[PDB]
C-alpha cells in the first residue's frame, strides 16, 4: 500500500531474525555445555568418549555453519560490487559494514 | 513471540546448566571419596588395589573431561575471532571472560 | 457436500488424535518404566549403565518433543494474532485457551 | 480402531510392567540373600571376602537404580509442570501422586 | 494384457511372501537358539551375560515386530471399513478373516 | 528361488543347532567332571577349595542359562498366542509341544 | 564413445574387483590367524577368552557374508530367469556358471 | 594400484604371522620350562604346589587355544565347501592342505 | 553489446571456475587428511573404525566424481565430433586437448 | 572474491592440519608411554597385564591408521593418474612427492 509500511515490516523482521540468530549461537554454546556435563557424569568410559566425540562434532558444525554464512554474505555483496563493473556502474555499499552488521554485531552484545 | 522471552529462557537454562555442572564436578569429588573409603575398608588386598586403580581412573577421566571442555570453549571462541579476520570484520568479545565465566566461575563459589 | 459434515469429521479426527497423543505420552512413561526394570535386572554393570543412559535419553527426548510441540502451537497462534496487526484486523482467539486445550487438557485426565 | 481399546491395552501393559518391576526388586533382595549364604558357606576366606564385596556391589547398584528411576520420574513430571509455565498453561497433575503410584505402590504390597 | 494374468502373478507373489515370512519367524526362533548355545558355551561370565541380554533383545524385537505388523493390518482394514461409513457405502470384508490369513495362517502350519 | 529349498535349509540348520546344543550341555557336564578331578587331585587345600567354588559356579551358570532359554521360548510363544487375542485371531500352535521339542527333546536322547 | 571401450573398462574393473575380493577373503583368514596368536600369547585368561570369542565372531561373520553374497547372486540370476517366464521370453544364461565364476573361481586359485 | 602388489603384501604378512605364531608356541613351551624351574627351586612347599598348578594351567590353555584355532580353520573351510553345495557350485580347495599349511607347517620346522 | 565483451567475460568466468575446481579437489584431499587425524585420535575403537569407513567413502566419491566429469566432457566432445559425420561436416577440435585443459591442467600446477 | 584469497586460506588450513596430525602421532606415542608407566606401577598383576594388552592395542591401532591413511592417499593419486589414461590425458603429478609431503614430511621434523 505504501513504501514505509514495507520498510518497517522488513526492518522489524530483520532485527527479529538477527536477534534469534544470536540466541541460536548461544544455544549452540549451551549445547556444548550439556555435552560437557554428559561426559563429566556419564558412568561408563564409552559414554564419556562418545560425548567427547559429539562435543567435537557440535563445535565443528557450528564453526562450519558460521563460516558458510559469513562467506556467503561476503560473496553475494562482493559479487554485486564486481558486477557493477564491466558496465561502468558504481556500487558504493561498503561491504565490510554490512558483513559486520549482519553477522557479528548481534552476537557480540550478549552476556551469558 | 517476543525477544526478551527467548532471552530470559536462554539465560535461565544457562544458569541452571552451569549450576548442575558444578554439582557434577563436586559429585566426581565425592565419588573419589567413595573409592577412598572403599580402598580403606575393603578386606582383601586385591579389592583395595582395584579401588586404587579405579580411583586413579576417575581422577584421570575427570581431568580429561575438564580439559576437553575448556579446550573446546577456547577453540570455538578463538575460531570465530580468527574467522572474523580475512574479511575485515571486528569480533571484540574478550574470549578470556567467556571461557572464565562458562567454565570456572560456577565451580569456584562452592563449599563442600 | 455440506458444512456440518466436514465439521463433524474434523472434530472427530481431532479428538481421536489428541486421545492417541495422550496415550503416546503415557507410553513414553511406560517405556521409562521398562528401562527402569532393565537397569534393575541387567546382570552386568555395563548393561545397567547403558540402561541408565538410554533412560536419560528417553526422558530428554520426550521433554524436548513436548517443548517443541507447545512452542510451535504458541508460535503459530501468536504469529496469526500479530499478523492481524499492521492491517487493523482484530483476532480475538484467546491463544492461551487453545494452547491449553490442544496440549495439556487430554494429558491431565488420565490415570495409570 | 477405537479409543478404549488402546486405553485398555496401555493400562494392562502398565500394570504388568509395574508388577514385574516389584518382582525384580524382590529378586534383587533374594540375590542379596544368595550372596549372604555364599559368604556364609564359602570355605576359603578369600571367597567369603569376595562374596561380601559383591554383596555390597549389589546393594549399591539396586539403590542407585531405584534413585535414578524415581529421580527421572520426578524430573519428567516437574519439567512438564514447569514448561506449562512461561505460556500461561495450567498443568494440575499432582506429581506426588504419580511418582508414588508408579514407583512405591507396587513394591509395598508384597510379602516375602 | 489380461486380468487373470495379473491375478495369478499377485496371488503367486503373495503366497511366496507369506511363506518366506513364516520362514523368517522360525529363523528368528533359530537365532534365539543360537544365542542360547552361545550363553551356554561362552567361557567367561561376561560373554554369557551379554548373550542373555541380546537374547532378550531378540525376543523383544521379534515380539514388537509381530505386534506392529498385526496392528497395522488391523488398522488399515478397520480404517477402510470405517471410511465406508459417513458415505453410506457398505464394506463387508470380514477383517478378522484377512488379518488371520495374512498373519497367523502361514505361521501355524510349520514344524521345526 | 523356491519355497521347499528354504524349508530344507531351515530344517537342516535347526536340527544341526539343536544337536550341537545338546553336545554343549553334555560338554558343560564334562567340564563339571574336569573340575571334580581337579578338586580331587589338587595338592594344596586352597586349590581344591577354589575348584569346588568354580564347580558351583559352573553348575549355577548352566542352570541359569537353561532357565533363561526355556523361559524365553515360553515367553515368545505365549506372547504371540496372547497377541492373537484382542484382535479375534486364532493361534493354535500348542506352545507346550514346541517348548518341549526345541529344548528337551534333543537333550534326552543322549548317553554319556 | 564406442562399445568395446566400455566393454574393456567393465571387464577390467570386474577382474580387479574379484581379485581384491579373493584378497579380502584371505585377509579374513589372516585376521583369524592374528586372533589365534592373540589367544595363544595373551597373558591373562580373560584376554585369551575374549580372543576366542572374537575369533568365533570373525569366522561367523565371514561365513554369513559369503552366504549372503552367493545367495544374492543366485537370487538375482534366478529371478531374471523366472521373470523371463510368464512372457514367453527365453533366458538361457546358465546361472550355475555365473554364480561359480563370480564367487568361487577367484578364491580357489590362491595359495597362502 | 595393481594386483600383484596386494598379492605380495598379503603373502608377506601371512608368512610373518605364521612365523611369529610358531615363535609364540615355542614361547609357551619356554614358559612351561620357567614354571618347571620355579617349582624346582621354590623354597616353600606351597609355592612349588602353586607352580605345579599354574604349569598345568599353562599346558591346558595352550592345548585349548591350539584346538580352537585348528577347529575354527577346519570349520570355516568346510563351511564354505558345504555352502558351495545347494547351489551346484564346485569348491575344490582341498581343506586338508590349507589346514595343514596354516597350522602345523610353520610349527614343525623349528628346533629349540 | 560487443563480441569481445562476451568473450572476455566468458574467459574470466571459465578460468575462475577451473581454479576453484582445483581448490575443491585439494579441499577433498584436506578432508581426507581430517578424517585421517580423526581416526588417529578418536579414543574408542568404534569411532576410529567409522572414520576409516567414511575416509573410504570420501575417496570413493571423489574418484567417482572425477570419473563422471572427465567421461562427460569426453562424451560431449566425441558426440559432437561424430554428429559432424553423417552430414559431411568437418569438426577438427582435437578433443584430447580440450579434455586435458578443462580437467587436468588446473589441477596439476598446485602444491600443498 | 579472488583466487589467491582461496589459495591462501587452503594453504593455511592444510599446513595447520598436517602440523596437528604430527602432534596427534606424537600424542599417540605419549599415550604409549602412559600405558608403559601404568604397567610399570600398577600394583596387581592383572592390571599390569591389562595395561600391556591395551598398550599392544594402541600400537596396533596407530599402525593400522597410518597404513590406511597412506594407502588411501596413494590410492586416490594413482587412481586419478590411471583414469587420465583410456582418454589420452596426461597427469604428471609425481604421486611419490605428494604422498611423501602429505604423510611423512610433517612427522619427521619433530623432536620429543
Author numbering:
A (entry chain S), B (entry chain O), C (entry chain R), D (entry chain N), E (entry chain Q), F (entry chain M), ...: 38 to 149
Passage from the reporting paper:
Here, we determine atomic structures by cryo-electron microscopy of three conjugative pili, two from hyperthermophilic archaea (Aeropyrum pernix and Pyrobaculum calidifontis) and one encoded by the Ti plasmid of the bacterium Agrobacterium tumefaciens, and show that the archaeal pili are homologous to bacterial mating pili. With structures for four bacterial conjugation pili (pED208, F, pKpQIL, and pTiC58 from A. tumefaciens) and two archaeal ones (A. pernix and P. calidifontis), it is clear that there is a common architecture for all and obvious homology, despite negligible sequence similarity. Each prokaryotic pilin subunit consists of two or three hydrophobic α-helices, with kinks appearing in some of the helices, such as in A. pernix and A. tumefaciens.
Cryo-EM analysis of the P. calidifontis filament preparation revealed pili, which following the reconstruction to 4.0 Å resolution, proved to be structurally similar to the CedA1 pili of A. pernix. While in the A. pernix filament the helical rise and twist per subunit were 3.6 Å and 76.5°, respectively, in the P. calidifontis filament these parameters were 5.0 Å and 74.2°. From the secondary structure and side-chain information present, we were able to determine the pilin identity directly from the cryo-EM map using DeepTracer-ID39 to be P. calidifontis protein Pcal_0765 (WP_011849449), which we name TedC (see below). Although TedC displays a similar fold to CedA1 from A. pernix, the two pilins are processed differently, with A. pernix pilin not being processed and the P. calidifontis pilin, similar to bacterial plasmid conjugative pilins, undergoing proteolytic cleavage. Notably, however, the mature P. calidifontis pilin contains an additional hydrophobic α-helix (α3) compared to pilins encoded by A. pernix and bacterial plasmids. In P. calidifontis the extended density could only be explained by a bipolar cyclic tetraether lipid. The cryo-EM map was good enough to identify the cyclic lipid as a glycerol dialkyl glycerol tetraether species (GDGT), a dominant membrane lipid in many hyperthermophilic archaea, including Pyrobaculum species, and we have modeled the simplest form, GDGT-0, into the cryo-EM density. Thus, the protein-lipid interaction stabilization relies heavily on hydrophobic interactions for P. calidifontis.
